[PDB]
Ligand binder design. Structure first.
Ligand SMILES: [Ca+2]
Ligand SMILES: [Ca+2]
Ligand SMILES: [Ca+2]
Ligand SMILES: [Cl-]
Ligand code: NA
Ligand SMILES: [Zn+2]
Ligand SMILES: [Zn+2]
Length: 619
């Protein structure tokens, strides 16, 4: 089941053309006036060129999927965007001022992310940044909205994340982050607990209380309307919590003694319906705690605000569980009715009766990463075309961030070495050994260290490189093997002693687990090969000089393994790295070093030779 519907007060989506033009207009220069068929193709191609697509004026199923990914606000072409044409700070000791904050994080967390982000650059150069609290700084950092005042409009949630100006005078070096995003540490809403036995810690989302997991703070269980979360998943066992900040419930310092803001509250000539930074330089939100702040002068600060709902019509009201939507009960956010996979929930017990809903918090974007990238702009750097480079336009979450050679190169190209960076694979121009090679949802996927190449047919150049984190962020630095499960069409990734199962970019719940869960002897803590067989549907996991079989139907291994690579296969070298059996052509190819071996399904002598780079990749 799944009927589609339009939700009351939702932002209609932009159609591909509308999207294209905006992308081309925003990042490529094609003027709003010149967009026509001719300009769309040509300019299109320039974008396609930059991102590795085929050069064509047509809007490719991937050309659209690419210009649909959140990215930086800066263009890809012509460093002629309001900064000094000489791309490089003329000093080596730079200052910055945080002018704006975001309500999604506590200042300490926001300050730290920025500093960590500057450190990204101090580490590989002689640039040293210092934070000043008054007057103009080299790099001013703010958070704003659509039109933030320098003439480069942001457009709400997702899409453009931030934009920084090149080193120069006035607006030069200045970094802006879109306030309509939700700034998490990259992995989900970040909230910093307010009081109790977890006063310093972050909420732990999800956390399990009474039978329900919470993915935002709740007043469930409470009587006094206060919000809370635990530090750990198991609240029942660990039992540590604190109150989540919200100025409707309480406020910090000031003279109001923790009481809630009073909304609206008259400040001088204005009535404020939220905290403001008016009257202030530190950028701290604040609010009168009584309706006439002048008359009573009772104020408290609003350092952080826990969110529950974003957009929709409920104005951030919390979800209600269980909630009934189209005659079915939902106890968690779903995408019923939305064709865009975005997750929402009702904010009342019944959507059918009330039609009130809202989007639930998503993974957000790390301010850290986004900052570090924007800050590269501020040092004079420009957009790299290297998928593994921080200064690539598109945003990709990377649990473990490492500045890439390409980045270090440029920053050191502008400034010193310091008082040597990761590199990125090129398939055709270098003979390399893939970590795992396997067909996925009908596409061949070639993995390596931090990147993956993919294709729908082996008689064409391979699409990529692409950082694998943009599909499988929870996966580690390198996989050991890959595979597909015949029953659910799910991807199963191996690495060290764990394995992950995904289904369409969604990390399986319960994953990762130790390989023992697959039914492998505790001795192995690695497996170097994997794949399924169309005839038998039996999954063989190769490690060293032995292999095993997995029953996907029975979810158990088969009668007493392992077997040998030579004892069960005639010509197969042990410690070989990959295996792939494309669907629909009885041939099983086993890869080792840079060159592979084939096989007919009905016979092991069944072979014909070849090599990976030449035979496999259009090279
Ligand atoms: Ca400045
Ligand atoms: Ca945005
Ligand atoms: Ca392997
Ligand atoms: Cl493999
Ligand atoms: Na494989
Ligand atoms: Zn950028
Ligand atoms: Zn701006």
């Amino acid at each position: 089941p799944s009927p589609i519907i339009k939700f009351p007060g939702d932002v209609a989506p932009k159609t591909d053309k509308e999207l294209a033009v905006q992308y081309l207009n925003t990042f490529y220069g094609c003027p709003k006036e010149s967009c026509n068929l001719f300009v769309l193709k040509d300019t299109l191609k320039k974008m396609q060129k930059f991102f590795g697509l085929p050069q064509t004026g047509d809007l490719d199923q991937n050309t659209i999927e690419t210009m649909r990914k959140p990215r930086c606000g800066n263009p890809d072409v012509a460093n002629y965007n309001f900064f000094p044409r000489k791309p490089k700070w003329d000093k080596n000791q730079i200052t910055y001022r945080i002018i704006g904050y975001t309500p999604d994080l506590d200042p300490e967390t926001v300050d730290d992310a920025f500093a960590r982000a500057f450190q990204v650059w101090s580490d590989v150069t002689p640039l040293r940044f210092s934070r000043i609290h008054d007057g103009e700084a080299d790099i001013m950092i703010n958070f704003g909205r659509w039109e933030h005042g320098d003439g480069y409009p942001f457009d709400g949630k997702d899409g453009l994340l931030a934009h920084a100006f090149a080193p120069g005078t006035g607006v030069g070096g200045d970094s802006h982050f879109d306030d309509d995003e939700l700034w998490t540490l990259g992995e989900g809403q970040v909230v910093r607990v307010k009081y109790g036995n977890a006063d310093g810690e972050y909420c732990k989302f999800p956390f399990l209380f009474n039978g329900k997991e919470y993915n935002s703070c709740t007043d469930t269980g409470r009587s006094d309307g206060f919000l809370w979360c635990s530090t750990t998943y198991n609240f029942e066992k660990d039992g540590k919590y604190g109150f989540c900040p919200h100025e409707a419930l309480f406020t910090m310092g000031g003279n109001a003694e923790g009481q809630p803001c009073k909304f609206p509250f008259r400040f001088q000539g204005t009535s404020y319906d939220s905290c403001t930074t008016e009257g202030r330089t530190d950028g701290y939100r604040w609010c009168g705690t009584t309706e006439d702040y002048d008359r009573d002068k009772k104020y408290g600060f609003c350092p952080e605000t826990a969110m529950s709902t974003v957009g929709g019509n409920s104005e951030g009201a919390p979800c209600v569980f269980p909630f009934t939507f189209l005659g079915n009960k939902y106890e968690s956010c779903t995408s019923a009715g939305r064709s865009d996979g975005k997750m929402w929930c009702a904010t009342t017990a019944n959507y059918d009766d009330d039609r009130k809903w809202g989007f639930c918090p998503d993974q957000g974007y790390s301010l850290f990463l986004v900052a570090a990238h924007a800050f590269g702009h501020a040092m004079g750097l420009e957009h790299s075309q290297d998928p593994g480079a921080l200064m690539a336009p598109i945003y990709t979450y990377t649990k473990n961030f490492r500045l890439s050679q390409d980045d270090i190169k440029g920053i050191q190209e502008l400034y010193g070495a310091s008082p040597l960076g990761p590199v990125t694979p090129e398939i055709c121009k270098q003979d390399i050994v893939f970590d795992g090679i396997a067909q996925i949802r009908g596409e061949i996927f070639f993995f390596k260290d931090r990147f993956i190449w993919r294709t729908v047919t082996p008689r064409d150049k391979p699409m990529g490189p692409l950082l694998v984190a943009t599909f499988w962020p929870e996966l580690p630095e390198k996989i050991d093997a890959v595979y597909e499960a015949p029953q659910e069409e799910k991807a199963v990734f191996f690495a060290g002693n764990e394995y992950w199962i995904y289904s369409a970019s969604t990390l399986e719940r319960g994953y990762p687990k130790p390989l023992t869960s697959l039914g492998l002897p505790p001795d192995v803590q690695r497996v170097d090969a994997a794949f399924n067989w169309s005839k038998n549907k039996k999954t063989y996991i190769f490690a060293g000089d032995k292999f095993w079989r997995y029953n996907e139907v029975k979810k158990k291994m088969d009668p007493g393994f392992p077997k040998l690579i030579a004892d069960a296969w005639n010509a197969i070298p042990d410690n070989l790295d990959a295996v792939v059996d494309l669907q629909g052509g009885g041939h099983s190819y086993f890869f080792k070093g840079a060159y592979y071996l084939k096989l007919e399904n009905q016979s092991l002598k069944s072979v014909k030779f070849g090599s990976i780079k030449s035979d496999w990749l259009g090279c």
